[PDB]
């Protein structure tokens, strides 16, 4: 076990830790003089889910236990840390890329001629986001928080829902079909990419 943060998934970096300590003997009875770590059997390739940093971190420290009571409460501990980077290839091509095309294709609703076509297609688009949200959740790991892919999905829901409002608003706004606001075929991609950029800095 180790504290693992998968928020930047699939571009997350993890630390695989090993902590070793004598079970019954303090550092006055048993102490670690040195630690040597070998990871040669692990060799990085494109066929590996994780990529190691190669330079493993090793340490020997003294752990003081509060519940214990002349310095008979310190234990010698070995700590080994192996830095790994996730291989994001599979997730970029089979998840992020098709999601982009789906979201981009949702902006094409502003190119339909009639209000009826624009509003009805929005529902098929909403159904496409739901069908996609599931495809991802069924494969991506279970987490107690949202990843980067999870946020894209929410943006898709927002983009389609916001489009629905503009499609209706444009229709019943004028005193007698605001086809000018319908020229927002550019405002949605830009406004979306703009919101997309400010979301990257959050991680």
């Amino acid at each position, epitope marked *: 076990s180790n504290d693992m943060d998968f928020r930047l998934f699939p571009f997350d970096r993890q630390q695989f830790v090993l902590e070793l300590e004598p079970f019954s003997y303090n550092n006055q009875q048993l102490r670690f003089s040195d630690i040597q770590v070998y990871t040669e059997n692990i060799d990085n390739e494109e066929i590996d889910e994780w990529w190691i940093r190669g330079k493993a971190s090793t340490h020997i420290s*003294d752990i003081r236990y509060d519940h214990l009571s002349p310095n008979q409460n310190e234990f010698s501990r070995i700590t080994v840390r192996i830095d790994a980077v996730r291989n994001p290839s599979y997730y970029l091509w089979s998840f992020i890329l098709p999601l982009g095309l789906i979201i981009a294709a949702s902006w094409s609703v502003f190119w339909l001629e009639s209000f009826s076509e624009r509003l009805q297609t929005s529902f098929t688009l909403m159904l496409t986001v739901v069908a996609y949200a599931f495809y991802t959740s069924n494969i991506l790991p279970r987490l107690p928080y949202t990843t980067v892919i999870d946020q894209m999905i929410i943006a898709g829901y927002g983009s389609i829902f916001a489009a629905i409002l503009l499609i209706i608003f444009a229709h019943h706004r004028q005193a007698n079909d605001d086809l000018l606001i319908q020229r927002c075929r550019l405002a949605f991609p830009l406004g979306f990419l703009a919101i997309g950029c400010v979301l990257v800095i959050r991680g």
Partner: nanobody
Amino acid sequence: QVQLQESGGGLAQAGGSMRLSCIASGRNFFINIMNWYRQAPGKQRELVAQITRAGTTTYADSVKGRFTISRDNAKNTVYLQMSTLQSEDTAVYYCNVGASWGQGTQVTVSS
């Protein structure tokens, strides 16, 4: 597989001083304890001085007050200052880290 390379040694003067040094090198290691051993011609290998990462030192009774151990933690380098030398100090001095040993440097005190 930690490599230890001792430096210094040779002929020394009774009542004089000599400084030995040892460099530890390798891949993925962390040293907590660095030692200096010596083995007299027909005696057993004995611990002379020891230093922890925290800097706490301990010496054999025969060398206490005369010898001084020091270290540069970052450089994995240990030193032994052998002051007010005596004929008994004649031995092969070994640098040690766990199961790793230096080649052994001969120190011969002459009077």
